[PDB]
Structures are given as C-alpha cells and as structure tokens.
Design an enzyme around this catalytic site. Structure first.
Site, mmCIF file in Angstrom:
data_model
loop_
_atom_site.group_PDB
_atom_site.id
_atom_site.type_symbol
_atom_site.label_atom_id
_atom_site.label_comp_id
_atom_site.label_asym_id
_atom_site.label_seq_id
_atom_site.Cartn_x
_atom_site.Cartn_y
_atom_site.Cartn_z
ATOM 1 N N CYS A 74 -8.512 29.939 -4.976
ATOM 2 C CA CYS A 74 -9.329 29.164 -5.812
ATOM 3 C C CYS A 74 -8.810 29.243 -7.255
ATOM 4 C CB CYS A 74 -10.989 29.741 -6.017
ATOM 5 S SG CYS A 74 -11.116 31.481 -6.185
ATOM 6 N N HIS A 112 -15.494 33.478 -7.231
ATOM 7 C CA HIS A 112 -14.858 32.024 -7.015
ATOM 8 C C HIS A 112 -14.838 31.374 -8.444
ATOM 9 C CE1 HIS A 112 -13.861 28.284 -5.328
ATOM 10 N NE2 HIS A 112 -15.205 27.796 -5.614
ATOM 11 N N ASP A 127 -14.238 21.150 -7.341
ATOM 12 C CA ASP A 127 -13.605 22.144 -6.775
ATOM 13 C C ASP A 127 -12.756 21.790 -5.826
ATOM 14 O OD1 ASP A 127 -13.334 24.744 -5.638
ATOM 15 O OD2 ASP A 127 -15.510 24.930 -5.285
#
Length: 248
Positions: A74, A112, A127
């Site tokens: 991430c 995250h 994302d």
C-alpha cells in the site's frame, strides 16, 4: 529524479498525458489496478532501518514497480500513484486507515495508506494499493450508495471515522477499512512510519472484477459474483501467481 510520468503511464497502459478530469482519474485508477499487482513477497527487503518512509527513496520504489515491472504494497503503490496524480495536476491528499480484520475488529489505526482527490468541488477516494476485494474505480466521499462492476459501495460515518463498506451480489454489507478524513494531508506521505515466510498477499483487478490470492486462499469476483477456492496443487498455485503477476 528518476520518477517519470511517461514511463509510468506506459507501464499502466495509458496513452499520452490525459487531461486532469474525473474521466481520466477513473481510467488511471482502473488501469493501475489491472497492470500493477499488489504483492508483499519482497516488501521486507525494501524496509528502512529508520522506520521512516522518507528514508526509502521514491526512485527505489519507482524502479522496482515501474522500471522492473513488479508489484508492491500500500505505501509503495499509493505513494507512487499520489506522485503521478500530483504531476498530472490533481489535488491529492494522503490518508491512513485501519483495516477490517477477519474477526470483525479494525487493526492498527494507520496500517493502510491511500489518497483522496478533491476535484471540481467533490472528493474522491483513490486506492490502487489494497490487497483484498475493493473498488476498481474511485469512490465519492459519501454515504450515498455507489455501484460499480456488480458491487455496491458506501462511505458511512461512525464514531469519528468514515468507513468504506462493500456489498457484492448475494452477500451483506461488510466494512473494508476506516479512516479519519480530517487528517488528510497533501504532504502526508512524508510523515508515514513503518521460520516459514509470512503470509503472502497478491492481487490485481480484471476488466470486470478482481483476483486475490492470500496464502492458498484464491478469490475471484466477476461482475459482482464471488467464488473462492483453497488451492492444493503446486502447479495450480503457480498458475494463479503467474496470472496475477502478469498484469492486464
């Protein structure tokens, strides 16, 4: 100084320097998730002793993901995507989130890392760096139901957090992750802090869904219809790894 917009756009299959619009943002988001897989296989090798993400040069991550064609995690994929979006003219803000766990709790608060884009008076969630089942195109920051590729999404508010929730066909709503929108920061990437092998996570989007491999657990969603299988055979396992990592 090695970050290069054109090289990145070629890496994700996008032509030219498309204009700074919502239609472009939606295309870039989907293409990135199709072309650049999530992969935590070698993530430990790129960690900095200092625990500060700033100490991992962006060019190192760019070289691994863009130049060499590999996947990432991430704080690699969304970090690169934030920079690409900023160089294409978007107002991008970094945000951190806590991920829903299998037992229904939320994990650590800043585990995250993803982004928000404010464009034309509306805020979108961005994302391209989340391993599990989630949105292939940006969401609006809104509790209004949103529909894409056979699934529904909403971003509800609960106890000072905004919660991304997802509902595929035939299933109930489930949270994906939660975040505090007011902590978004244009410069937030600068503040991030970081025997059998650990569990491997690999995934990518497809034209109409996503394919996800968590250990032996293989998940596919196609137009909102989900299927799962725990992989036994080594050859089938390798075929699925290859399919994810080859991109689309």
């Amino acid at each position: 100084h090695m970050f290069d917009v054109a090289k990145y756009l070629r890496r994700i299959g996008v032509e030219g320097t498309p204009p700074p619009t919502l239609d472009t943002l939606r295309h870039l988001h989907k293409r990135h998730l199709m072309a650049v897989p999530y992969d935590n296989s070698t993530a430990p090798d790129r960690l900095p002793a200092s625990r500060h993400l700033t100490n991992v040069p962006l060019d190192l991550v760019f070289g691994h993901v863009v130049t060499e064609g590999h996947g990432g995690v991430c704080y690699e994929l969304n970090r690169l995507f934030h920079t690409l979006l900023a160089e294409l003219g978007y107002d991008v803000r970094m945000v951190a989130a806590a991920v829903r766990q299998a037992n229904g709790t939320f994990g650590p608060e800043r585990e995250h890392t993803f982004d928000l884009v404010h464009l034309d008076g509306r805020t979108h969630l961005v994302d391209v760096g989340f391993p599990g089942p989630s949105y292939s195109e940006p969401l609006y920051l809104s509790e209004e139901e949103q529909h894409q590729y056979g699934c529904s999404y909403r971003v509800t508010e609960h106890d000072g957090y905004r919660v991304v929730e997802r509902r595929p066909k035939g299933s109930d709503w489930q949270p994906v992750y939660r975040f505090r929108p007011e902590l978004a920061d244009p410069s937030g990437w600068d503040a991030v802090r970081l025997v059998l092998a650990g569990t491997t996570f690999r995934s990518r989007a497809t034209d109409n869904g996503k394919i996800v491999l968590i250990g032996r657990r293989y998940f596919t969603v196609e137009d909102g219809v989900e299927r799962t299988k725990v992989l036994v055979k080594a050859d089938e396992f390798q075929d699925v790894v290859d399919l994810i990592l080859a991109g689309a």
